[PDB]
Design a protein around this ligand. Structure first.
Ligand code: CLR
Ligand code: CLR
Lengths: 303, 57, 338, 126, 220
């Protein structure tokens, strides 16, 4: 047990989560609808977008109990089973999202860089098998917290859920894993995939230079929106774990970084709200399909 | 030049088309109307059959 | 003396026009001006037949009003069970460029054809359950645009070589040829008595043919562009034609004239398929604007729209019992409506 | 019934001028692109000119640019070909070809075989 | 109680759909091509020649016994990967007829998404006729200049390259009058004896499929 300053933890992280829920429920539903429309047109990318939107929907569904928790200055006010289930979703999802972003990257790379070559790898069946494998490996590689304790009543009046001060060793190594594999590997693969997509688009003759510029802007937007919103949390997590592995007997870093840590968590949700915006509404066909669907639904429900 | 047999067959077909028995379009219209009236009940698309008689629902 | 023959032809067609106008007493609009409108015909999609890979060009119902044949440019003929949505037969074709297909009124044969210039007949009932090519009718020098069975041994074929042909299937020979069109023939339609068929071509003309005599009885004009679809009215005394001029027209044999025009100002696409209902009261027309319109054949009013295809409607068929209508499209889907 | 009557041909001195006219009937004239097609004595059909439905887009074959001019009067259902500075290369039969379908930007109508929407032509001799 | 007929029809359906999945896999891997001309030994109503480049299958179709009126059967070729348009670069005005046909194929509402691979052939005869006629058909030639972004092939005067590039520009005027991104014209130069023609067609088909994939994968 050590000190923790909760000056903004009960304001900023709830405010953000509220904005995230309010904006991301409609957008993630529309994104899931457009992805289903794509997969019913025989398009793998629709399968991956469907899984992305499902992960984000789950994350948004468990946010209310986190804004409740943060409004209580980190007070769980629930039972340990709720803590386990929901806290497990609060992180597993953030990584399932990054993994399906990597899947969309590699699928686009296969389509654009090597057309005429890999057809088996570009079937809806293969997309479904890969999505199932991704869900399985993520939910099994981030299952270690489910075999431990997650509710802790420090003497500081904060009933922590999935977070302890100082931390343990297994959570230090789980943190190293979550930073280096679960974040840096899919992001590096995305960077490489979009680099390949950009060189292949440079080789294009039937594409105007403007279109090339638009594609480059979209790719840089994807990479940067992932990094800007997931990098602060993970540099802080990695610093915490390194200082701990270095000297578990010390709470200066937690005292000085505890208020930036949960702000970083809040910043990650922005990805969950960000994903549907880019991967659905930057495009012409998906915007047109969702506009048609919404206008029709409203109109002929009014009848 | 070579269209002589074409033109003579054209005039032959035309003179075989001109000499036929035509009826007034009022009588033909009345016949079409009578066929539509006499067979209106036997038309599932004009008068939809109940759901117990529809092989598609 | 070519000028002499042209003068004779012009005077003869003037005589034909005067004889036609001498019979135009009252417009159909004036005779059906007091009959009740049909209201709003609302049809619903009951079946969506999936399985074709490429665009659908042809579709024929069976006389049992349950089985269907569809031809797609992937190279397959599929025999559908409309009730259970199952596939009864999938026949791979030698040429994938099929433009027409036809189900035999007996249920034993199915024909197809296209850019190979050949009418291939397939046996559906063999002792080993195999679908075989019974006969390949060669002799057309242009593409094969429409096939229609007279019986199990006779078939009528339209072609891009401006000629129609009547074939003896067992001998594989061409019994009678029907010349007289100037543009490539697009669609045929047999009369209910199988003694007369009507032909629609890319010269804005429709010709009535005697199947036995081999001669052209009447020639109908009135369209401005190529005629893409033709269909006999159930009585056999009239027929409807749809053209690339965004217009469908009702002609009558015994009057030798056009009786009604089916056009609207906001329709600027060609008609791809026409079919009548069992009563002959409705006229379903397929259009290039992705949907089918339902016309009141007696009042020239638009009674309904069949939306639900995301590409060009190519096929349109009504069952012999009049229960359902089938629509084919270039989106590779067959839909059944009721 | 679609008819296209061409008039105005005749024998002209090398260097003179003519005015061919095409009277249309049996279709909405203002809905179709119209053309002028030529057929030299021992050659096939050659395209000459092309006017749009309104008269804004006009194109000619290269050998007749600056010399010929095409116009249409949608109110009178007529098409005109004013020919200036005629050469003996212009001696041919001039047909008035209508494009097959309305409201389109493409035409397939120079076929040596029977194209349907084409008049019988007028003879120009130089 | 005839559940037997129903289960037999469902088993037949299962066999049919298994065969349909396999022939679908075969269909998506084959690229259809239309050979429209004014080659048979390069490498009925319609002739088919199958090739293979880098283990990719191509099916080329040249129309045989069909009448010169094309407006009805050209709608069957709206889903091909590309139309290969072969022009004899140059006694009628065959070049203007080629330009007219290309304009009709380009502005057809059904070929509005079909890219064209253009092959301007007969350049040996074109060369020996330029040196020695084309300006009897095209007046803008006597006032046309070879572009600067043009390949300086070794051995040939600016005259033949001027003719070649003037004809290529005559086609590119039609091809760019649209300005909408839905289908493209890949102009190439062909000789009497060549070997890289199949490579050019393969590269252009790779480009067409890649553009279609950029559109399909929400990347454009
Ligand atoms: C077109 C389809 C086949 C492309 C599929 C790309 C898949 C196989 C790539 C993209 C994302 C990658 C995953 C990214 C993250 C992880 C978690 C790690 O602990 C094990 C490797 C693993 C599981 C990778 C496996 C391979 C992977 C799933
Ligand atoms: C612990 C529990 C809640 C985990 C549940 C994971 C479920 C929701 C994941 C794993 C497998 C995924 C499915 C894989 C295949 C398909 C078929 C596709 O056409 C629609 C998406 C869909 C239906 C996915 C929906 C989401 C999915 C069902």
């Amino acid at each position: 047990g050590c000190h923790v300053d909760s000056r903004v933890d009960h304001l900023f992280p709830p405010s953000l989560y509220i904005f995230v829920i309010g904006v991301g429920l409609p957008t993630n539903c529309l994104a899931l609808w457009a992805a289903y429309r794509q997969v019913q047109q025989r398009n793998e990318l629709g399968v991956y977008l469907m899984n992305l939107s499902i992960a984000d929907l789950l994350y948004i569904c468990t946010l209310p109990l986190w804004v409740d928790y943060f409004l209580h200055h980190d007070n769980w006010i629930h039972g340990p089973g709720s803590c386990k289930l929901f806290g497990f979703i609060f992180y597993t999802n953030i990584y399932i999202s990054i993994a399906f972003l990597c899947c969309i990257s590699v699928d686009r790379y296969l389509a654009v860089a090597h057309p005429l070559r890999f057809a088996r790898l570009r079937r809806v069946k293969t997309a479904v098998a890969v999505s199932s494998v991704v869900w399985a490996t993520e939910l099994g590689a981030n299952s270690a917290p489910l075999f431990h304790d997650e509710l802790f009543r420090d003497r500081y009046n904060h009933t922590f859920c999935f977070e302890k001060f100082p931390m343990e060793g297994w959570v230090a190594w789980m943190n190293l894993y979550r930073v280096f594999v679960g974040f840096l590997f899919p992001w590096a693969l995305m960077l490489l995939s979009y680099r390949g997509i950009l060189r292949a688009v440079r080789g294009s003759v039937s594409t105007e230079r403007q279109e090339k510029a638009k594609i480059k802007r979209l790719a840089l937007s994807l990479i940067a929106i992932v990094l800007v919103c997931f990098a602060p949390y993970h540099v802080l997590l990695l610093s915490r774990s390194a200082i701990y592995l270095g000297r578990p007997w010390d709470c200066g870093f937690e005292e000085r970084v505890f208020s930036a840590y949960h702000s970083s968590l809040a910043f990650t949700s922005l990805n969950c709200v960000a994903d549907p915006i880019l991967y659905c509404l930057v495009n012409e066909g998906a915007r047109s399909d969702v506009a048609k669907a919404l206008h029709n639904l409203l109109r002929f429900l009014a009848s | 030049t070579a269209s002589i047999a074409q033109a003579r067959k054209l005039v032959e077909q035309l003179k075989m088309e001109a000499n036929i028995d035509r009826i007034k379009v009022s009588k033909a219209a009345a016949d079409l109307m009578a066929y539509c009236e006499a067979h209106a009940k036997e038309d599932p698309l004009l008068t939809p059959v109940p759901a117990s008689e529809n092989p598609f629902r | 003396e070519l000028d002499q023959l042209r003068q004779e032809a012009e005077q003869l067609k003037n005589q034909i026009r005067d004889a036609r106008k001498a019979c135009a007493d009252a417009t159909l609009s004036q005779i059906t001006n007091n009959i009740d409108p049909v209201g709003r015909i609302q049809m619903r999609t009951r079946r969506t037949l999936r399985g074709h890979l490429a665009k659908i060009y042809a579709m024929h119902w069976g006389t049992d009003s349950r089985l269907l044949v569809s031809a797609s440019q992937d190279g397959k003929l599929i025999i559908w069970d409309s009730y259970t949505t199952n596939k009864v037969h999938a026949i791979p074709l030698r040429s994938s460029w099929v433009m027409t297909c036809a189900y035999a009124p007996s249920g034993n044969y199915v024909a197809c054809g296209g850019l190979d210039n050949i009418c291939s007949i397939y046996n559906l009932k063999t002792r080993e359950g195999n679908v075989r090519v019974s006969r390949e009718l060669a002799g057309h020098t242009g593409y094969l645009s429409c096939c229609r069975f007279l019986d199990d041994n006779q078939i009528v074929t339209s072609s891009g070589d401006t000629t129609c042909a009547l074939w003896d299937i067992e001998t594989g020979q061409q019994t009678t040829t029907f010349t007289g069109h100037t543009g490539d023939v697009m669609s045929l339609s047999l009369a209910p008595d199988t003694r007369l068929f009507v032909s629609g071509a890319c010269d804005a003309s429709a010709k009535l043919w005697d199947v036995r005599e081999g001669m052209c009885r009447q020639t109908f004009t009135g369209h401005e562009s190529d005629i893409n679809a033709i269909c006999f009215f159930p009585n056999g005394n009239a027929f409807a034609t749809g053209s690339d001029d965004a217009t469908c027209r009702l002609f009558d044999l015994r009057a030798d004239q056009e009786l009604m025009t089916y056009s609207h100002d906001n329709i600027i696409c060609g008609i791809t398929s026409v079919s009548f209902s069992k009563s002959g009261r409705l006229l379903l027309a397929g259009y290039d604007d992705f949907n089918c319109n339902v016309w009141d054949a007696l009042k020239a009013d638009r009674a309904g729209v069949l939306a639900g295809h995301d590409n060009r409607v190519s096929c349109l068929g009504v069952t012999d019992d009049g229960m359902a209508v089938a629509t084919g499209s270039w989106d590779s889907f067959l839909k059944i409506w009721n | 019934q679609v008819q296209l009557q061409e008039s105005g041909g005749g024998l002209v001195q090398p260097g003179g001028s003519l005015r061919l006219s095409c009277a249309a009937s049996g279709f909405t004239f203002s809905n179709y692109k119209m053309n002028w097609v030529r057929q030299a004595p021992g050659k096939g059909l050659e395209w000459v000119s092309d006017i749009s439905q309104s008269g804004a887009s006009i194109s000619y074959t290269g050998s007749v640019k600056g010399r010929f001019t095409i116009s249409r009067d949608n109110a009178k259902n007529t098409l005109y070909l004013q020919m200036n500075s005629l050469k003996p290369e212009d001696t041919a039969v001039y047909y008035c070809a209508r494009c097959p379908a309305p409201f389109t930007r493409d035409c397939f109508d120079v076929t040596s075989t029977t194209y349907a929407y084409r008049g019988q032509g007028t003879q120009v001799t130089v | 109680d005839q559940r037997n007929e129903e289960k037999a029809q469902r088993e037949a359906n299962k066999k049919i759909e298994k065969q349909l999945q396999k022939d679908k896999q075969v269909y998506r891997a084959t690229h259809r091509l239309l050979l429209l001309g004014a080659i048979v030994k390069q490498m009925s109503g319609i002739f088919e020649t199958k090739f293979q480049v880098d283990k990719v299958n191509f099916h080329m179709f040249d129309v045989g016994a069909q009448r010169d009126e094309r407006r009805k059967w050209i709608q069957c070729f709206n889903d091909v990967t590309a139309i290969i348009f072969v022009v004899a670069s140059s006694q009628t005005n065959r070049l203007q007829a080629a330009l007219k046909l290309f304009d009709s194929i380009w502005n057809n509402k059904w070929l509005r998404d079909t890219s064209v691979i253009l092959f301007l052939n007969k350049q040996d005869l074109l060369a020996e006729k330029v040196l020695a006629k084309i300006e009897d058909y095209f007046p803008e030639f006597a006032r046309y200049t070879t572009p600067e972004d043009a390949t300086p092939e070794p051995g040939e005067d600016p005259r033949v390259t001027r003719a070649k590039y003037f004809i290529r520009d005559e086609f590119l005027r039609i091809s760019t009058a649209s300005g909408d991104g839905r289908h493209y014209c890949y102009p190439h130069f062909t000789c009497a004896v060549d070997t890289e023609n199949i490579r050019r067609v393969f590269n252009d088909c790779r480009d067409i499929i890649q553009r279609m994939h950029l559109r399909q994968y929400e990347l454009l």
